[PDB]
Design a protein around this ligand. Structure first.
Ligand SMILES: C[C@]12CC[C@@H](O)C[C@@H]1CC[C@@H]1[C@@H]2CC[C@]2(C)[C@@H](C(=O)CO)CC[C@@H]12
Ligand SMILES: C[C@]12CC[C@@H](O)C[C@@H]1CC[C@@H]1[C@@H]2CC[C@]2(C)[C@@H](C(=O)CO)CC[C@@H]12
Ligand SMILES: C[C@]12CC[C@@H](O)C[C@@H]1CC[C@@H]1[C@@H]2CC[C@]2(C)[C@@H](C(=O)CO)CC[C@@H]12
Ligand SMILES: C[C@]12CC[C@@H](O)C[C@@H]1CC[C@@H]1[C@@H]2CC[C@]2(C)[C@@H](C(=O)CO)CC[C@@H]12
Ligand SMILES: C[C@]12CC[C@@H](O)C[C@@H]1CC[C@@H]1[C@@H]2CC[C@]2(C)[C@@H](C(=O)CO)CC[C@@H]12
Ligand SMILES: CC(=O)N[C@@H]1[C@@H](O)[C@H](O)[C@@H](CO)O[C@H]1O
Ligand SMILES: CC(=O)N[C@@H]1[C@@H](O)[C@H](O)[C@@H](CO)O[C@H]1O
Ligand SMILES: CC(=O)N[C@@H]1[C@@H](O)[C@H](O)[C@@H](CO)O[C@H]1O
Ligand SMILES: CC(=O)N[C@@H]1[C@@H](O)[C@H](O)[C@@H](CO)O[C@H]1O
Ligand SMILES: CC(=O)N[C@@H]1[C@@H](O)[C@H](O)[C@@H](CO)O[C@H]1O
Ligand SMILES: *[C@@H]1O[C@H](CO)[C@@H](O)[C@H](O)[C@H]1NC(C)=O
Ligand SMILES: *[C@@H]1O[C@H](CO)[C@@H](O)[C@H](O)[C@H]1NC(C)=O
Ligand SMILES: *[C@@H]1O[C@H](CO)[C@@H](O)[C@H](O)[C@H]1NC(C)=O
Ligand SMILES: *[C@@H]1O[C@H](CO)[C@@H](O)[C@H](O)[C@H]1NC(C)=O
Ligand SMILES: *[C@@H]1O[C@H](CO)[C@@H](O)[C@H](O)[C@H]1NC(C)=O
Ligand SMILES: CCCCCCCCCCCC
Ligand SMILES: CCCCCCCCCCCC
Ligand SMILES: CCCCCCCCCCCC
Ligand SMILES: CCCCCCCCCCCC
Ligand SMILES: CCCCCCCCCCCC
Ligand SMILES: CCCCCCCC
Ligand SMILES: CCCCCCCC
Ligand SMILES: CCCCCCCC
Ligand SMILES: CCCCCC
Ligand SMILES: CCCCCC
Ligand SMILES: CCCCCC
Ligand SMILES: CCCCCC
Ligand SMILES: CCCCCC
Lengths: 333, 333, 333, 333, 333
């Protein structure tokens, strides 16, 4: 055998009982899979690499080059114990075998690589939905060793993160990958070193525009055509307003089907409910006109053209709606 | 080897055949994941720690400090056998390796830590839904050893429970974590000691308000505008009431889609069905008015203005609805 | 070692080549989890215990008391081979270790306990749904040994079944747990002994009442108010009947969404379709009245008050509906 | 030990390097679970048995009877390697242990039994849906050995298939179980022997009748009552036809929700679209009548009873619908 | 033993420390399972075969023919380490045993075969949906060895890919299977050789035609019948247009339920929204006619037949719709 595995006890780390051992980390991201608003999490696939030195794995040679071993030798040597903090589930791919790489140099330097898929939590804010922007991160830490036993750092600084050129999401734009570091404390175990991978997402607005904003505006404009119809056709003007109200209610109900039940109002809700109020007032206007006409007829009868309300509504309603749209799209850009 | 594993039989507990062995327990909660009303359960992730002494694991040293071992040595020594009572499913995280920690002091004291995810049952009461409050707990017990063999207790009393500062639920407010203890009996195996983790949840009401209570009130108010319309427009006043009835029915049907089929009435059902009855009576009022008008016309014909019912309805209906709202929101706060 | 495991061949049962060995069985039920109408199955969690004697496990002592062993010794001795007949899936809980107990007395008596979750088939009859009652059972049998090798029986007769005081289902009432026994034959392997666990379920009716029966009756009563409206308002009386028909159809469609596609009619279907027929006839009545009125007008014209049909309908329709309800609720209680 | 396992190398089949070894197969079917039209597959549970002879498993005795072994001895001997062709997923039940049986006679004959659940593909034709009939099969073959190494056959001919007396499907009738055999070729590995299990399914028609065919016929008949209403009530005759059209469209949309998107028309689609066309023509008839009446009035005005179209429609529409029904139900039986 | 396994160290590849070892690859495709538009992936099942030479597996014989071994010998020898690039999940079938084949010739040539199921990503473009065409591929590469250690190539060139004669998809047409090769680079590990399997899919259009395009055209044509109705029936002409608008909106909402939220418009959306605009303009036309008629009546009153707009609309609307259809079906074929 080229490696003297049987001569050592690999239940103890290199430098056991002494100074801490440094371990470097390098990463390449392969894909971003899915994003859930109800669960508030994301899924990622990536390659994870480790670097350290262990003098028990030294072997003699003349070329001084790395050699590759098959990968079932991993379970017989010491290996770091990284885990993903705040994750829900994860696994290691194993077809047609375990996706594991092991390379050793003659002096004892080791490279160790894995392929994993992780689901991790992300806390999202929906006050500007669907014109919102989110920030998420992934955290890496050792489970068992404190900073007095294992020192964890990025292998090459800022150059330690790479991404695939094919990374894409159908509903979001991805930008600004970078890495950071921070210490963490547990009240009963000690201090640990954490690594972070940060990125930002921006949602696409076109679908929501065409699917939600256009129909509501069309219904609001459809409510205005009743002001131009003769007031003597009562069963021609009542159903138009009633149907507009019902369709607006259906749109409002259908919009919320995909979202969690948060305790605050979103940007699209304001628009939809203002439109609903506009249509409701349009319905009340004709009732006022009809009542006043009947009262006037009775008063003229007891003594033995267009009403002003319609004429004013024809100008007042569109101007108010246009002003609301100006303010709304200035605030939410 | 530093530890003399091969010299002992670890199929027997420490102090086998004698007094019971004490085991202490410490916990840190990482997250609360999901809550299901149809299944009546919750999911939790946490770190679980054990403390005991075993003289077979003693080794010589001079510094008198804990040493950390890699974690594959767990399957060769004796270890406690805790399990979660009344749970549906659970697992131990295992990427990139088993999330396990093992630390031993020179005298033989042991610390053993794990990372687990559990789904557990909780019995919920929905009589005040959606203005309700729930209480749930998680139970820990040994499977095989009775109190004559193993003594289970909280390691530091009330200071044995910690929580993450990021614990959050989108639909609930979390409060009042605390711990208790109680004995349990099985008729064919004996007495056991149980540990409890208790907490309380309060639901957020804003979403339900805006989604359910506002539309029903708007429909009820929309039914009242017919009292102000001339009674000679029969096909203008019938469709308004009919459409209000149908929309109320649709809202009632849509509300129940997310809930289990309990054998009692909930708080929101009372409100919705009272609103439905209000709209139904609004429909019946116009039929009465029309019948009386036709009868009066026939009687006046055989001899050769606003009806009182509308005038009274205009005041009676809103006052009754306001009184109902006052009583309802005083009872359910 | 206290037990002489290495001195025996545990691939053979106790009393190999001779008379059969008796094995007793004891059970405690922990929970009933879910019931599926489309799949026709249920899920159960329980503790399962075995009793037998094996002289190869004898050890010397003075106190004559049971001793508990850690549980990894199970895979080195002989153990029975029970399985669940007619089951779809099952597993054994394994956090934080296998939920297994092993106790041995000095003479060689053994107690062996496990914690399992099972999904099993149950054949349900829905002719009286949703006022129905179902009966289900769970079956236990050895896989490999016939009655000439292994004798299976209940350990203490009728006292061998216990249940948790917290067992509950949100939609059903649980009653009448009991146990039975019966022999089974396979044409190519032989005779086997089976154990049964029987129980009964009764569904709660309140939700179905409030959700389905009340709206249909309200629609049927809403169809009757047209008989009191003047016959000269044709576009006021046609839409009322049409909308009642459409709403009844929607209710009928929504009711069936949760049920399997059986080849017979259920109790609720009869009620819903009779209501639909009532509303359809209500629609036809006004067409008859209108046609007769127009014919009479033409006949009176060519020579140069309330129609009887409405007056009779006002009494005939409610009486028939009340009679149908009396008969229906006498038959289905 | 009764069996001399350690004295042989069980990585080689019986008769290695010589003539092929015969293996017989016997089957009992326990249940048919589910049928998916969108995925076009079915699920089955069954017991699978194997028969062969291996002289390395001979042991001495006097009674000459089969002996049963616990079942963990399977992983130490040679065993056949059957797999299910064209399957999507499958598993072996393992509670409370692996559902495995092993019986050996003193001369070396072996019986080996398993309990499995399989999901397999079936290609379905929906041109006569929902009055259709389907045929499906399950295929069994060895993975690694060609016919020159292993000979696969039915153990007892036609008597090798048994079924449970409780096998049932809620939506189908099951009939005609039988078995066949055929050879298969792979261009790079060789020739193999396949076994088949065939059966037929017939769908139940009652639910589809009551749910789909009756409402469409009722809507078509409801369209005809307008021919008997006076032509001077325009806003009483337009809404009736419009509502019938809309309800027919809703029924058509609701019918297709459960089916895959095939590239041909089904039997129910023809009926629904013919009904839709009938209602559309009913709407056009009144427009023609109204236009002709207005033209006649203008012509009579410029010179200073029932229209024939209604009278003919009253007879022509029902006769055509009855003729269509006769032809349709003669073709599709 | 025929093979001298115990005399060698199989943690090192053949030709360790020297020139690279060639490995050939051959494939037969069994099925294509499912295609997801929201997830943008596909599932495939196939047989995978490897070819190489290892002199450590030589054995003496006279016939010079391949011999088959049981398959548990795989875990004791060296074997290649292929994996699927850009895949989400995969597994190896294992009933009734691992689907693995191992054949060795006396000189040391090896054949090794497996049966696997893979889910892999495919980037789809929906600008021409549902008249679109997609191209997908599957990628095979070694995980641990670079081109200086292992040379990967197609075993027989273009003749290395076979497909089953039963491969079918219900919604797509499959064509043009072929293979390619390309080198790949990782910035921290080196150069690797990749193999590709390419194919093309074309969707079936019949279902979408009958389900979506026909109803929208029918609604558009139904909007035109109002131009032929007398303008004095206001509550007969308003509801027709309103109902057409609402039904068009429902169709548009129902179409999008199955698709991802892309940031561009699809082919079917253009058609549906143009139809919606047509119906909206149809509604506005009658409002214009009514307003002009009322104004003319007032003007004629103050001094003390068919309107031109309807007559022109009857020709202008159908011609514009026909022209739009011509252009649309010329562009999208
Ligand atoms: C056309 C529509 C949506 C569809 C109807 O509701 C009408 C509004 C009018 C205002 C528009 C808006 C789409 C989004 C716009 C173009 C805004 C943006 O630049 C977005 O970043 C500024 C003004 C906005
Ligand atoms: C506005 C709305 C809901 C929307 C319509 O139904 C009208 C009611 C009127 C009474 C309101 C209620 C919302 C909840 C309120 C504010 C109660 C609370 O403090 C809740 O803790 C007291 C009075 C309640
Ligand atoms: C109120 C309602 C349901 C809601 C409307 O359909 C009207 C019926 C009238 C008859 C009622 C029935 C509910 C169930 C009752 C009370 C029966 C039972 O004791 C049930 O065990 C006997 C009479 C039944
Ligand atoms: C009653 C209904 C369905 C409900 C309405 O559409 C009217 C048709 C009329 C023709 C009937 C059909 C049901 C199926 C029948 C009875 C056919 C069969 O024996 C079926 O095998 C022959 C004639 C068919
Ligand atoms: C009948 C229908 C769909 C249903 C209504 O919208 C009317 C159009 C009219 C134009 C037709 C189209 C179906 C697809 C056709 C036949 C095109 C194709 O050869 C497709 O490759 C050319 C013209 C197209
Ligand atoms: C790639 C690399 O670093 N190679 C070096 C080589 O240059 C040096 O001569 C040798 C001596 O041990 O060590 C190794
Ligand atoms: C942290 C701790 O308790 N350290 C003690 C140390 O103070 C003491 O001198 C030694 C003697 O055995 O035991 C250990
Ligand atoms: C609990 C029990 O049965 N204990 C008995 C004990 O009474 C008896 O003296 C002893 C002699 O072997 O056997 C044991
Ligand atoms: C069931 C059966 O076949 N039993 C036979 C038995 O009749 C025969 O005497 C014996 C001799 O080896 O072989 C065995
Ligand atoms: C199938 C095949 O290639 N068979 C050959 C055989 O023709 C040759 O005589 C023998 C000598 O070693 O090698 C082998
Ligand atoms: C990347 O690292 C460099 C060097 O430490 C630092 O100056 C820079 O701010 C980092 N970039 C980001 C985006 O954090
Ligand atoms: C916590 O423990 C202390 C000490 O036993 C006890 O007094 C106190 O009531 C406990 N708190 C709760 C909330 O149970
Ligand atoms: C319980 O067992 C006893 C004794 O065998 C028997 O008499 C009784 O009928 C059983 N009870 C039931 C409910 O089967
Ligand atoms: C069953 O097998 C017999 C004997 O080979 C054969 O004659 C018969 O046709 C088979 N039955 C069927 C239904 O295939
Ligand atoms: C198949 O391989 C041959 C030989 O290399 C090549 O000429 C041909 O273009 C290939 N076919 C395809 C479709 O790539
Ligand atoms: C009826 C729609 C009115 C739209 C008014 C235009 C809004 C433009 C806002 C631009 C702010 C940047
Ligand atoms: C039409 C809505 C009437 C709402 C009446 C106000 C209810 C306030 C109740 C306050 C009780 C604390
Ligand atoms: C309109 C509802 C009529 C309900 C008639 C009462 C039915 C009571 C049946 C009691 C039988 C036990
Ligand atoms: C309006 C429904 C007409 C139904 C006509 C009867 C069809 C019977 C067909 C019998 C063919 C075997
Ligand atoms: C109302 C439907 C009009 C359809 C006009 C025919 C379109 C044919 C386009 C052929 C282009 C190849
Ligand atoms: C809901 C009340 C409407 C009142 C309308 C009366 C206009 C003066
Ligand atoms: C459903 C019956 C309505 C009766 C209305 C008659 C008013 C006197
Ligand atoms: C001259 C026709 C007036 C119609 C205006 C409609 C505005 C929505
Ligand atoms: C809609 C407001 C009209 C005001 C008339 C004085
Ligand atoms: C709605 C009640 C009116 C009472 C008239 C006497
Ligand atoms: C509804 C039946 C009326 C009978 C009139 C003679
Ligand atoms: C519906 C066709 C009527 C024919 C009148 C000549
Ligand atoms: C619809 C356009 C009509 C033009 C009349 C001048």
């Amino acid at each position: 055998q080229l490696l003297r595995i049987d001569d050592h006890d690999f239940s103890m780390r290199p430098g056991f009982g002494g100074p801490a051992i440094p371990v470097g980390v390098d990463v390449q991201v392969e894909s971003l899979d899915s994003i859930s608003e109800v669960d508030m999490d994301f899924t990622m696939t990536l390659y994870l690499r480790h670097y350290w030195k262990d003098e028990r794995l030294s072997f003699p040679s003349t070329n001084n080059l790395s050699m590759t071993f098959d990968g079932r030798l991993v379970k017989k040597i010491w290996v770091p114990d990284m885990f993903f903090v705040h994750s829900k589930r994860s696994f290691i791919h194993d077809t047609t075998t375990d996706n594991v790489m092991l390379r050793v140099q003659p002096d004892g330097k080791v490279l160790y690589s894995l392929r994993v898929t992780v689901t991790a939590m992300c806390n999202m804010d929906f006050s500007r939905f669907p014109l919102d922007t989110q920030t998420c991160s992934l955290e890496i830490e050792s489970y068992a060793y404190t900073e007095d036993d294992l020192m964890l750092y990025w292998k090459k600084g800022n150059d330690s993160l790479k991404t695939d050129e094919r990374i894409s999401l159908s509903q979001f734009l991805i930008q600004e990958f970078h890495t950071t570091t921070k210490l963490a404390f547990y009240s009963s175990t000690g201090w640990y070193n954490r690594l972070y991978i940060n990125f930002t997402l921006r949602r696409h607005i076109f679908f929501f525009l065409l699917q939600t904003y256009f129909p509501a505006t069309l219904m609001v404009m459809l409510s205005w055509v009743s002001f131009w119809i003769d007031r003597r056709a009562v069963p021609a003007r009542v159903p138009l307003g009633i149907t507009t109200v019902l369709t607006m209610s259906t749109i409002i109900t259908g919009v919320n089907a995909s979202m969690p039940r948060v305790s605050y109002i979103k940007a699209v809700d304001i628009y939809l409910w203002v439109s609903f109020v506009f249509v409701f007032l349009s319905v009340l206007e004709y009732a006022a006109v009809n009542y006043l006409t009947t009262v006037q007829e009775r008063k003229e009868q007891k003594l033995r053209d267009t009403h002003a309300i319609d004429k004013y509504s024809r100008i007042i309603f569109p101007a108010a709606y246009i002003l609301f749209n100006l303010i709304y799209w200035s605030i939410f850009s």
